[PDB]
Design a binder for this molecule. Structure first.
Ligand SMILES: c1cncc(CNc2ccc3ncnc(Nc4ccc(N5CCOCC5)cc4)c3n2)c1
Ligand SMILES: [Cl-]
Length: 273
């Protein structure tokens, strides 16, 4: 089902960044005549199958693979502003004094932009839950930002701090509910919990959840029922949505459809203000 692209049709331009299990290049792709794309260089067939199967406005567009020798390539649409975690951090309260001279309006993202970012990640999660698909690793580091604040889920691995994953098989324990940490029970309800944690990342401008703690201390705090504090930039109504995602019992957590509807209502009420 995965579309195969000829190596000759892929012209690598320059590296955009590099992660753990691969590199990311800006490239030009022919016969897709001349298109600007992002190429990830390294199961490969299973991850490619998933990206082929998924098709939504808030899931990164996938064009196919190149298995003509080595290295294995994955072709995606180019998302200009990169990963959402770095985007949040570089557009936070300390965006002006740290940004470059050419950078357009350096400063923190306003409430309207934070809600639009949150609403687009939720739209992608609504699509995944409708297909009974469990992501298992939802976090801003796995999201991408394109021109005009277009936000999409881009991956189904890399990290900002090495502490994002815990060796139990690497688990993103800071994003996980107690049933996932304790029994590896992954469901659309464990994904809604991770979405509540993504909301916390958005409203802290990309801070690591439980940053003050080591992964073993975070496991203890999470399983004991400790809740992440309300971020300074988070309105009380957004924190109430986070708490709805964080109900201890998986079946008591708000559905992603209701979370999305509430984020969309708040975003619409703030558009003209
Ligand atoms: C990340 C999240 N989700 C999916 C991925 C792979 N998939 C895709 C697809 C399309 C892409 N279009 C542009 N950029 C992409 N990724 C990219 C570019 C630069 C960085 N860095 C490295 C660290 O310092 C700052 C710059 C990071 C990631 C990208 N990744 C990657
Ligand atoms: Cl509340």
């Amino acid at each position: 089902c995965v579309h195969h692209i000829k190596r000759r049709d892929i012209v690598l331009k320059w590296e955009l960044g590099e992660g753990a299990f691969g590199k990311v290049f800006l490239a030009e792709c022919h016969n897709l005549d001349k298109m600007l794309v992002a190429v990830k260089a390294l199961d490969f067939q299973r991850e490619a199958e998933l990206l082929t199967m998924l098709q939504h406005q808030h899931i990164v567009r996938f064009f196919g693979v190149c298995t003509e020798g080595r290295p294995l390539l994955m072709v995606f649409e180019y998302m200009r502003h990169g990963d959402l975690n770095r985007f949040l951090r570089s557009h936070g309260p300390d965006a002006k004094l740290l940004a470059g001279g050419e950078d357009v309006a350096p400063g923190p993202l306003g409430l309207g932009q934070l809600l639009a970012v949150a609403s687009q990640v939720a739209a992608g999660m609504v699509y995944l839950a409708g297909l009974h698909f469990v992501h298992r690793d939802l976090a801003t580091r796995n999201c991408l930002v394109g021109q005009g604040l277009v936000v999409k889920i881009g991956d189904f691995s890399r990290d900002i701090y090495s502490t994002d994953y815990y060796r139990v098989t690497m688990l993103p324990i800071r994003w996980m509910p107690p049933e996932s940490i304790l029994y590896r029970k992954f469901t659309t309800e464990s994904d809604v919990w991770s979405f509540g944690v993504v909301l916390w990342e958005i409203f802290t401008y990309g801070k690591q959840p439980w940053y003050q703690l080591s992964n073993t201390e975070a496991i203890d705090c999470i399983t004991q029922g400790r809740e992440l504090e309300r971020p300074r930039a988070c309105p009380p109504e957004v924190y109430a949505i986070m708490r709805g995602c964080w109900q201890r019992e998986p079946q008591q957590r708000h559905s992603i459809k209701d979370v999305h509807a509430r984020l969309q209502a708040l975003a619409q009420a703030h558009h003209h203000h």
